[PDB]
Amino acid sequence: MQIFVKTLTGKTITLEVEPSDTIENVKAKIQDKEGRWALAIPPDQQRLIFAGKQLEDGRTLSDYNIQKESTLHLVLR
DSSP: OEEEEEOTTSOEEEEEOOTTOBHHHHHHHHHHHSOGGGGGSOGGGEEEEETTEEOOTTSBTGGGTOOTTOEEEEEEO
């Protein structure tokens, strides 16, 4: 499954994920794709949003009915 994430700087990144990937697993992937600048932002200070909802690290994409080609947003927390 492919999803897109909008980063803190508005750049779009494309991720390859399984439907039961956890939000934590998705965040690790985003960290690898993103830039050095973000090297200073701790993981627990960033949150993913989808369809108005704050996504919890331990729940899965499938828990939130996130389907292929969904766009998530990485925001401050």
